[PDB]
Amino acid sequence: VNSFSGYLKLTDNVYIKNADIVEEAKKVKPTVVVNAANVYLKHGGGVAGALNKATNNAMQVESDDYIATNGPLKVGGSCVLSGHNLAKHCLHVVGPNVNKGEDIQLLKSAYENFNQHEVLLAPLLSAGIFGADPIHSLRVCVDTVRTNVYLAVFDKNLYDKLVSSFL
Ligand SMILES: O[C@H](c1ccccc1)[C@H]1CCCN1c1ncnc2[nH]ccc12
Ligand SMILES: [Cl-]
Secondary structure (H helix, E strand, O other): OOOOOOOEEOOOOEEEEEOOHHHHHHHHOOOEEEEEOOOOOOOOOHHHHHHHHHOOOHHHHHHHHHHHHHOOOOOOOEEEEEOOOOOOEEEEEOOOOHHHOOOOOHHHHHHHHHHHOOEEEEOOOOOHHHOOOHHHHHHHHHHHOOOEEEEEEOOHHHHHHHHHOOO
């Protein structure tokens, strides 16, 4: 039993809810919140900008030190950093940004990072401003993640389409 509330169950291990991931994180304080990161951990917009704003820029400060030490992530890769005031940990995961020409096949590799954590709150990778089809992203999620994932979809109109079209 966990404290996630109001999710629709899609499969044995995947759940979904129309919700602002920032507001969800502040309520649940999950062990792991997933950020829709880029390789530079520059949290400018989308989910990343919103999560960072909610940490009063502490996420960005920590991220800049991470990059200075380690260099950029790989597309499809991840790192674990602090969750600050939102969660115990933040798993920064880089899905391909179609608007940069990045290989959509890397979306499965990106979701594989979730399997290193038993329970996660997360957005649909590569969706929104990353330019991929959110319906496709949900399919890859369900077919790749085996751990328990609670998906927050910000756009209510998009949420309804994802549910109604889910196979
Ligand atoms: O799939 C969502 C989406 C939202 C709008 C249009 C298309 C897709 C992702 C991708 C872009 C942002 N987003 C979010 N998801 C959950 N919580 C969020 N808080 C702030 C942003 C955000
Ligand atoms: Cl985003």
